[model samples]
Target chain A: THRLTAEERNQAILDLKAAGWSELSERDAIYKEFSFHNFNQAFGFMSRVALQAEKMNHHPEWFNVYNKVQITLTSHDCGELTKKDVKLAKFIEKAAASV
Target chain B: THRLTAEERNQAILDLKAAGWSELSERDAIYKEFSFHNFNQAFGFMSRVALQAEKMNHHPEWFNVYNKVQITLTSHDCGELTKKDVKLAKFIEKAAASV
Candidate 1:
């Protein structure tokens, strides 16, 4: 489990924040909310994440209701934010934008 | 949010058990663990579930690691087993079998 170095964390947070992700102070995690036109589109985005998460051996904590999905990404293995979370978040942005 | 009738519950349990599901004593839910030949196959199965869950407006509590996925199905709306759980479970079985 490769934890993000301080330099890496600062850069990733800067980029992710500009993309609408937010930091959760209560936990070492990054959060983002996605809204789609309908449940189908929202679910389609999640499907892409599911496949990519498995490929990276990393998963997200998320809740979905109708067309809205709230996601939190963290490296549970390292009990902190890591490159995997940043990587997944970047992919998630692409998935959300595509749908 | 249609709760399963007692009769419906029994029959659904029977069918689900034959497909490798088990009941959780601590909750009114059915559980199943799926192991695939590889992570790709396991993620494919979960992708199918994610889409179906959104379509049905019912979601699952699940955990995945590499080639394994463990799932629990229940109707949170009814606070017990329901047709939706059975429906999703059947779909999950089909998804797993397909990959």
Candidate 2:
């Protein structure tokens, strides 16, 4: 339930950038786009993310088209970044890499 | 390989609009946003669509956040609506209704 501090958010930006996540210009959120071999792989990865997000109750705002999925993570309740976003982003990295 | 005729396009817009789909002002695509009771229902519906889309080799441009999904349908190869879009839209209606 805590929002990330400015320093914490900066560190998140740095760390998540290494995994291809980017901070938004206008929002307190991190975004990433995942590319897969085909629709099957892309949708499969979404299914995995969906299940995990439901389990965590920390859903992603994501767009999908064929082999691509673009996702944004933020804590809407706090209107900022949170550990929840970091945790989900890490899970997403593992999910995309595995798929 | 055929684009929807003007008459067919009009009819599709009329029929699909009744089902809550909209024709884009600048794009030759039909768009709809679906809502469900919760993430489980929403993600389940998407999984169903993904399987069917894969089988047909036709995909959707879609966005999801929690219990909502926004979907756009167009035949990229034809640069306009096609029978494929109509077919997929019908399948999506059935899929969404079922879930």
Candidate 3:
């Protein structure tokens, strides 16, 4: 478990983007989108994140329009980007690769 | 989608209380308190809610003050009670009874 200060949150975003993660709006939240070959693949993305998100108690705001999954993440309790957010985004990136 | 009817929502709250589920104050945007039991019991409560919450794609605003777990449920996007909120409330109630 890591507690990231405000400055660390900024650097975390930079690191995540450099690692090829799609980011959303800055400041309090980030957005990413994943498109797959089919609706099944899109739902697979949701299932993967859903399991890990439960473990972390960090939830994502997501929507699916057919094969595209639109995801946004933020630490609701903190009301800002947090270390937990960074970790969730990284896991999502890995999940997408598997898809 | 089997939408939760108004009667169902009201019945859910009744079932929840009958099952000994705790309800937070209705007026507060934030609800927090504490209680003492076993650490495992306390965390188990959180884990159950956390996992189900991800499935619903709805989350509770919660804080763990020692062995006590305080929780509040509200729809962020809708900013008030919605069908999603009612579904989650029933699920939490069942989980509470299991614990």
Strongest candidate by DockQ = 2
Instruction: Report, for every candidate in turn, its global Cα lDDT versus the true structure.
Output: 0.86, 0.90, 0.73
Determine which window of 10 residues in candidate 2 chain A has minimal summed lDDT.
Answer: A1-10
TM-scores for chain A, candidates in order? Answer: 0.96, 0.91, 0.84
User: CAPRI band of model 3?
Assistant: incorrect
Each prediction's number of clashing residue pairs: 0, 0, 1
| lDDT per residue (tens digit) for residues B1-99 in model 2 | 456778987888888999999999899899999999988999989998998888888899999888999999999877888888998999999999988
After best superposition, candidate 2 residue B37: deviation in angstroms?
Answer: 1.5
Top candidate (lDDT)? 2
Can you rank all candidates by TM-score, best first? Answer: 2, 1, 3
TM-score for predicted model 1 compared with the true structure: 0.65
Error of 2 at A28 (Å): 0.8
How many angstroms is residue A75 displaced in model 1 relative to the true structure, after the best TM-score fit?
A: 5.5
lDDT of 3 by residue, B12-80 (tens): 567656655544566413233435476687777777777787667788888786688777767787555
Per-residue lDDT tens digits of candidate 3, residues A1-99? 466877887798788877665555555788877889998888777777887987677889999988999888888887777789899999998888888
Report the C-alpha lDDT of model 1 over A1-99, residue by residue, as the tens digit. 467889999999999999999999999999998989977787778778887887888888776655788889999778899999999999999999978
Name the regions of candidate 1 deviating beyond 4 angstroms. A1-5, A17-37, A50-80, A97-99, B1-3, B14-27, B50-66, B76-79
Clashing pairs in 2: none
